[PDB]
Ligand binder design. Structure first.
Ligand SMILES: O=c1ccc2ccccc2[nH]1
Ligand SMILES: O=c1ccc2ccccc2[nH]1
Ligand SMILES: O=c1ccc2ccccc2[nH]1
Ligand code: FES
Ligand code: FES
Ligand code: FES
Ligand SMILES: [Fe+3]
Ligand SMILES: [Fe+3]
Ligand SMILES: [Fe+3]
Lengths: 427, 427, 427
């Protein structure tokens, strides 16, 4: 281990809370499911930050409660059982909970038990918008009064912040919160800790991983070998009370110099199609790639912690489409261009890159022995701000799926060919 | 956690040994194999309470020894090697053991070694009766003269105890010990701890899990949403020296009131076919369901600990059949009725219910955080008596399969598609 | 546990370092790949003694470096990326290393970083000969000038040592080092610790495992039930500075008496075709079977530790073939005789025998509780000499594949049907 590495002792001491957040940052908004994954009267179980959650849509509205019956701890989502529009029951011994408050309102065949009304399961705020269902995953005692607006946990918005983050080379990127904003994308389970997956996206030295991607050569893009920071303010850290907590990288300004060649190794980025974009990341770990893959379109990614060694990777493209005609155009371009060449192809390379790095960090070795360099100003800056502004460090799961990694149940599922997942299998 | 739960500190302190028996209660009788699973000269390896056991039938008689060669620990049952009617040898280096005493009588190519005769492997008492092979799984130092009769670890017998446990609504249930008693059923590995699986069977609130079983609607049975205890003596605890240690639930008396409806949730048990039955459980955890699924027929279930997170679930129906004609009638009704609709269909629901609860308890969380209620007087009573009368608590396996859950051998088998099991695979 | 066992307290205290070497003996030569597994410009990743290693052949020469980018710990071998004949780069962020020295010579898109030239990855000496690529697996601080010749970690050579180890009953066995020596064989991943796999080969009581092998009856050989030591010097321990450290068993002399029958168990070796051979073993655990399976042919086996519970089992036959005609004859006899009946068939029995013994030892039980006898003078003598002469005890892997056994990546691969392995899968 060399003394020339950027992550010296002083630096590492500045992001200890981050090193301690293997299970994720709790008391934050996270995408749970796409709207199309939860239809009227549909019940679905998931897990975020080690917390089991069950969702149900009733009369168009989505509710989220802890997917754990307080009687004997079974998941309520395994065999959806709802007798009324305002409740959800446990299919085992009948404990029934209020969808709105989570209170134990009754027990199917024991309506007079003294336990009734004296407790309940945790509820989770829901915010559904433009095809996406967001859930505020919180600790059992986090007060309702303290739940912040979804926007505080989403990337910086434009044109609102165009003055703060000038972007003369491209039109303003839309937000999932914008009217008529349309979302196209997917989410799949990633194998490995969320942090390692998250740091990949806004790292300007990692773009080497895409040197051979088909889209790069089909579009004849000008994708440099990497970018280099030229000043100490190459990244702007934002931490104002009202608004997202994160950072903006001044890409395509002199603060980040592109490297298009290395004669010594025989490398040279040949391409004439200019490709302008800009990355930023905000808690709980949301990436925004402005002007990607084309003008008026933006890419957002999430790395939702499921357990301490699995995460749900979200990848979406957003574009404001005011007319039916605009939507069809976007849908078409997504189907025959973006999805196959970008979300798949371009980003698939990131999938394996993130995985390949997991073994170094899981047992703690990497958090101490990694030897960072100049370009690592990005992940380091993120780790420090995340350590400073997270709303809580999730505790390890106890008495829930994932609390123990080598159960006979997990070996049974694995034997059957089922990989670690996210959405609870029913029946 | 509410203070209104039935399992308060005082109550929990009364079943600590039960909480400590994840690997099972040792020094007890357990069903090992059905007679048809061990033919003349056949050798089979199994595991109970973490103890590897090998069985061989010679001249019609079944013998059981520890399935662990004392030389270098291989399982004798993996490659059956018996050179004489009175012994069993290890296929690796030839250590040979007397079937009757387990003593090391010789070594194939080293007959004069000083180790010979100075030690041996543990032997286990066997009691085969009416199609079932029972084995007394005991500690290495449990004395032969202390081995109790099989009947002490089997459900209460009728008509013998008809006066003690009056049953005016149905004829006496036969015992596996009765003359001409015929057994039909099966056993299969269950994924999860034996205790959690065992408590499901005699829980009168869990019957909600069967509300949709085909047999219930085909027979138009009257299966209530659940039963409620009406008095403190709704369960009779029996603990007399000579006889089984367990409890009898006074089902179909005032002590247990049926709940056939819940207007508030829109539920109502419609059915005119009366279905009378009664459950009881005795150590080491044997369920008896009198008058099920029909008069003169009784169901017995075992949840045999294999390791601390797997068990062998036994499900059988018994009926005394004095004539060849009687046997054919029973075999036919089993084949085209009981098996498809009862053992499967009805009880398959229990399979998944038991599994769904395991995650809450494995790491210990559930044993402390569960919030039991009135109907839980059943499991609680069982836990207490089990704690007071068990003949020993099995120690974790050491140097045997299952001692370590994440070995490369297990990952190899899992990769090959093999689930955790019970019967040792040979060759 | 009997007091008549050969492994008494005093004896066990003499091989404690061996009990401590679950991850293998480091600073030793091990076979890595066959020459045919690494062609010109080919890159391959493996793991030995818990150390990740990547090899590349350039201009006919093979180089070996630690398969771990010092930047953020990914394996360099997962996506081979070499820009010049003298280097290998990390496909993720461009760190580039010198094949010869392992020094960090540059970073693709950050050629001026101060970290460059101040560190590098470990290099491993390579010795390719007659179709086999040997690698000297060493600790990061083991001096180049201290690397010993390959011959020191290979079995004793003949005729060089024919006087020291007289063999009147068969011609001298060739070495892999001999000119015109031809190698035919294979290596496959073994499931279980390397030590337990290794001790099987030179155990003269284990041959009982082959009593039913097809080759034995087709050749009508004379394979005794086992051999017995008759004197204290039945094994010669060699530990001279210049040369291999190991032991030679005086098979086919009066020091080892064959046992061809056991009337008491009805066993009798009925064979008239004499089969003369001799076994020896040297650090790091290399077996030599002289005159096997025929004259002028010798069998060598390795049990290379990968992790502490997996090893790469090597099985090869060597014969000196001076002419093209000789090579074809050897190839033909290997293809239609040795491979199907010897490497497979005869030795496949050992595969499962070794596996069946692993559970007893992994958690440490077997190393203390095994009850060894007279014939175990072989494994005991080996354990003592290994404890005394090993060049180092490998430390458990940290931050590398195998450091943690139950990662989600491992369950993902297992679910996909992939068994624990050795060669790193690419792309
Ligand atoms: O640095 C970068 C460059 C391109 C890119 C594209 C999609 C997602 C994240 C990305 N990050
Ligand atoms: O409470 C019950 C009710 C029915 C039943 C049927 C088979 C086995 C166990 C059973 N337990
Ligand atoms: O003791 C023995 C006897 C035969 C043999 C054959 C191949 C490999 C190892 C062997 N060891
Ligand atoms: S576990 Fe849910 S009602 Fe019993
Ligand atoms: S392990 Fe059974 S004789 Fe050696
Ligand atoms: S992990 Fe290899 S250059 Fe970054
Ligand atoms: Fe990328
Ligand atoms: Fe049931
Ligand atoms: Fe062998």
């Amino acid at each position: 281990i060399s003394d020339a590495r950027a992550n010296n002792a002083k630096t590492q001491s500045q992001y200890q809370p981050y090193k301690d957040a293997a299970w994720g940052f709790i008391n934050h908004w996270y995408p749970a499911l796409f709207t199309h994954e939860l239809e009227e009267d549909q019940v679905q179980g998931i897990q975020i930050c080690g917390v089991p959650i069950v969702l149900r849509r009733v009369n168009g509205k989505v509710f989220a409660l802890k997917d754990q019956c307080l009687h004997r701890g079974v998941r309520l989502s395994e065999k959806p059982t709802c007798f009324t529009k305002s409740t959800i029951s446990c299919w085992y011994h009948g404990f029934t909970f209020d969808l709105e408050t989570g209170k134990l309102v009754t027990i199917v065949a024991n309506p007079e038990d003294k336990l009734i009304g004296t407790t309940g399961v945790t509820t989770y705020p829901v915010h559904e918008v433009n095809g996406m269902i967001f859930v505020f995953v919180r600790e059992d005692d986090f007060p309702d009064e303290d739940v912040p607006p979804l926007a505080h946990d989403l990337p910086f918005r434009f044109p609102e912040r165009s003055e703060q983050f000038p972007h003369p080379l491209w039109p303003s990127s839309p937000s999932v919160l914008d009217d008529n904003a349309v979302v196209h994308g997917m989410h799949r389970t990633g194998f490995g800790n969320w942090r390692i997956a998250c740091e990949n996206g806004f790292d300007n030295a990692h773009i080497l991983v895409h040197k051979d991607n088909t889209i790069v050569h089909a579009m004849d893009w000008v994708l440099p070998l990497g970018l280099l920071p030229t000043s100490d303010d190459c990244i702007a850290v934002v931490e104002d009370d009202d608004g997202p907590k994160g950072m903006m990288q001044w890409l395509f300004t002199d603060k980040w110099a592109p490297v298009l060649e290395n004669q010594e190794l025989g490398l040279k980025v040949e391409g004439l199609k200019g490709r302008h974009y800009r990355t930023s990341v905000v808690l709980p770990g949301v990436l925004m790639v402005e002007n990607w893959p084309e003008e008026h379109v933006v890419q957002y990614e999430w790395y939702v912690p499921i357990t301490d060694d699995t995460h749900e990777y979200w990848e979406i493209l957003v574009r404001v489409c005011p007319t039916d005609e605009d939507r069809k155009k976007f849908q078409y371009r997504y189907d025959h261009m973006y999805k196959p060449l970008c979300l798949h192809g371009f980003n698939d390379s990131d999938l394996y890159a993130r995985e390949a790095m997991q073994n170094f960090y899981y047992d703690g070795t990497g958090w101490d022995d990694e030897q960072l360099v100049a370009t690592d100003i990005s992940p380091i800056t993120w780790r420090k701000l995340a350590s400073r502004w997270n709303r809580g460090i999730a505790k390890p799961g106890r008495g829930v799926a994932g609390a123990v990694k080598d159960t006979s149940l997990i070996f049974k599922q694995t034997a059957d060919g089922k990989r670690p997942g996210y959405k609870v299998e029913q029946i």
